[PDB]
Design an enzyme around this catalytic site. Sequence first.
Site, PDB file in Angstrom:
ATOM      1  N   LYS A  20      95.038  45.596 102.974  1.00 41.49           N
ATOM      2  CA  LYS A  20      93.424  45.208 102.856  1.00 41.49           C
ATOM      3  C   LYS A  20      93.174  43.592 104.127  1.00 41.49           C
ATOM      4  O   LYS A  20      94.350  43.037 104.840  1.00 41.49           O
ATOM      5  CB  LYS A  20      92.946  44.318 101.920  1.00 41.49           C
ATOM      6  CG  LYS A  20      91.337  43.584 101.385  1.00 41.49           C
ATOM      7  CD  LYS A  20      92.122  42.981 100.156  1.00 41.49           C
ATOM      8  CE  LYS A  20      91.512  41.263 100.554  1.00 41.49           C
ATOM      9  NZ  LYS A  20      91.609  40.624  99.355  1.00 41.49           N
ATOM     10  N   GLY A  21      92.225  43.809 105.007  1.00 42.33           N
ATOM     11  CA  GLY A  21      91.602  43.351 105.721  1.00 42.33           C
ATOM     12  C   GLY A  21      90.384  42.136 105.406  1.00 42.33           C
ATOM     13  O   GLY A  21      89.948  43.336 106.614  1.00 42.33           O
ATOM     14  N   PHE A  23      86.889  43.097 105.067  1.00 44.96           N
ATOM     15  CA  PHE A  23      85.984  44.309 104.887  1.00 44.96           C
ATOM     16  C   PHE A  23      86.790  45.488 105.901  1.00 44.96           C
ATOM     17  O   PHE A  23      85.758  46.593 105.031  1.00 44.96           O
ATOM     18  CB  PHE A  23      85.143  44.121 106.451  1.00 44.96           C
ATOM     19  CG  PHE A  23      83.672  42.793 106.680  1.00 44.96           C
ATOM     20  CD1 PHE A  23      84.316  42.090 104.856  1.00 44.96           C
ATOM     21  CD2 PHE A  23      82.596  43.252 106.354  1.00 44.96           C
ATOM     22  CE1 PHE A  23      83.209  40.453 105.045  1.00 44.96           C
ATOM     23  CE2 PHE A  23      81.205  41.952 106.999  1.00 44.96           C
ATOM     24  CZ  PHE A  23      81.210  40.912 105.399  1.00 44.96           C
ATOM     25  N   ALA A  24      87.775  45.091 105.643  1.00 47.95           N
ATOM     26  CA  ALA A  24      88.597  46.591 106.794  1.00 47.95           C
ATOM     27  C   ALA A  24      89.908  47.523 105.105  1.00 47.95           C
ATOM     28  O   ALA A  24      90.072  46.069 104.887  1.00 47.95           O
ATOM     29  CB  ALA A  24      89.295  46.198 107.683  1.00 47.95           C
ATOM     30  N   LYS A  25      90.040  48.052 104.831  1.00 46.77           N
ATOM     31  CA  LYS A  25      91.530  48.552 105.338  1.00 46.77           C
ATOM     32  C   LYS A  25      91.930  49.094 106.197  1.00 46.77           C
ATOM     33  O   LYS A  25      91.686  49.544 106.616  1.00 46.77           O
ATOM     34  CB  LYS A  25      91.820  49.883 103.942  1.00 46.77           C
ATOM     35  CG  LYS A  25      90.158  49.891 102.591  1.00 46.77           C
ATOM     36  CD  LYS A  25      88.631  50.752 102.929  1.00 46.77           C
ATOM     37  CE  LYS A  25      87.842  50.537 102.102  1.00 46.77           C
ATOM     38  NZ  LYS A  25      88.145  50.360 100.717  1.00 46.77           N
ATOM     39  N   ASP A 135      89.378  30.525 114.381  1.00 47.90           N
ATOM     40  CA  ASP A 135      90.554  30.928 112.932  1.00 47.90           C
ATOM     41  C   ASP A 135      92.033  30.673 113.832  1.00 47.90           C
ATOM     42  O   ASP A 135      92.259  31.503 113.167  1.00 47.90           O
ATOM     43  CB  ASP A 135      89.600  31.551 112.246  1.00 47.90           C
ATOM     44  CG  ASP A 135      90.458  31.171 110.899  1.00 47.90           C
ATOM     45  OD1 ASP A 135      90.124  32.528 109.672  1.00 47.90           O
ATOM     46  OD2 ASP A 135      90.878  30.489 110.239  1.00 47.90           O
TER      47      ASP A 135
HETATM   48  C1  LIG Z   1      94.825  45.485 111.567  1.00 45.68           C
HETATM   49  C2  LIG Z   1      94.693  44.409 110.988  1.00 45.68           C
HETATM   50  C3  LIG Z   1      95.975  43.119 111.676  1.00 45.68           C
HETATM   51  C4  LIG Z   1      95.181  43.289 113.142  1.00 45.68           C
HETATM   52  O1  LIG Z   1      94.255  42.235 112.958  1.00 45.68           O
HETATM   53  N1  LIG Z   1      96.676  43.477 113.952  1.00 45.68           N
HETATM   54  C5  LIG Z   1      96.378  43.516 115.462  1.00 45.68           C
HETATM   55  C6  LIG Z   1      97.785  44.171 113.245  1.00 45.68           C
HETATM   56  C7  LIG Z   1      98.531  44.636 113.994  1.00 45.68           C
HETATM   57  N2  LIG Z   1      99.936  45.561 113.747  1.00 45.68           N
HETATM   58  C8  LIG Z   1     100.118  45.466 112.534  1.00 45.68           C
HETATM   59  N3  LIG Z   1      98.845  45.092 111.383  1.00 45.68           N
HETATM   60  C9  LIG Z   1      97.942  44.236 111.780  1.00 45.68           C
HETATM   61  N4  LIG Z   1      96.997  43.559 110.932  1.00 45.68           N
HETATM   62  C10 LIG Z   1      96.848  44.472 109.454  1.00 45.68           C
HETATM   63  C11 LIG Z   1      96.433  44.946 108.625  1.00 45.68           C
HETATM   64  C12 LIG Z   1      96.790  44.523 107.165  1.00 45.68           C
HETATM   65  C13 LIG Z   1      95.908  43.082 107.150  1.00 45.68           C
HETATM   66  C14 LIG Z   1      96.321  42.321 108.716  1.00 45.68           C
END
Ligand SMILES: CC[C@@H]1C(=O)N(C)c2cncnc2N1C1CCCC1
Length: 285
Positions: A20-21, A23-25, A135
């Site tokens: 989870k992120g 608003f996003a999955k 942030d």
């Molecule tokens: C896609 C969101 C965040 C992210 O911003 N990047 C660039 C990323 C890049 N690589 C792996 N994960 C990333 N994440 C994770 C996914 C789950 C929580 C945050």
Amino acid sequence: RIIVDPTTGKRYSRGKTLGKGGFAKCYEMTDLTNNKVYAAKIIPHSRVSKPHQREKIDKEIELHRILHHKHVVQFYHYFEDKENIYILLEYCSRRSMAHILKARKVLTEPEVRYYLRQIVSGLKYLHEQEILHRDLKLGNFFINESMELKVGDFGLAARLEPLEHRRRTICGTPNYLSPEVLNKQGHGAESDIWALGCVMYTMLLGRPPFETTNLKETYRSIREARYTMPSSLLAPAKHLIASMLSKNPEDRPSLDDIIRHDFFTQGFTPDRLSSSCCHTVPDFH
Ligand SMILES: CC[C@@H]1C(=O)N(C)c2cncnc2N1C1CCCC1
């Protein structure tokens, strides 16, 4: 699952969830036209139904898409269909610094230098694009296969404004709110430097210098910039921290000053950290 961009053709293949992120999955996502894997945010339109939150992702996309730097998460592409917004970003296989510090509790000084130089590198780039991150936090420092740091999550990012026409309300809920923000002066480049001082403190000590509950009860301590400077800190670490957490934003060092401080120039720093450093304390020297 095959996902097609209805605007272009272009086909993608959805891989494993990353979690989870907001608003996003989040998912692995492969562009079938290079065969390269990206980290994708997938936001259903139902999560952005209100105009204000629609405007929120739109600005994130607008600001993020124009950035190209080795220590900023590389925006790849974004598109939408009838169900979702897709934001494809540079895939970082080794999570974030939040995950590392949770495991390690505290980092060694050469490691703090290694990561901080990279954060400073990316933030420098942003500040010259007159973009404020707003942030900075360990969870937003993404780490790739090669143990390289990329600053990400432009959710709260904004273009710099002059004080006279600047927003004065607290934007979102950041990890490290900054005396000037709590004095309703708004968030400038020095507020990012705040948050950088808090980051460095946390890397070295495993806890923030001020409470991060963002409760009004904590405002006075932050405004006053009074905190415990633990004796465990080496003298140069103590001095650089102190400068970044200057009460008056004007007293804080520039980014060029920060990386030229004795904390950096008088210690050893690796060119490359091993991934064992995610779990285990590295060897001396
Ligand atoms: C896609 C969101 C965040 C992210 O911003 N990047 C660039 C990323 C890049 N690589 C792996 N994960 C990333 N994440 C994770 C996914 C789950 C929580 C945050």
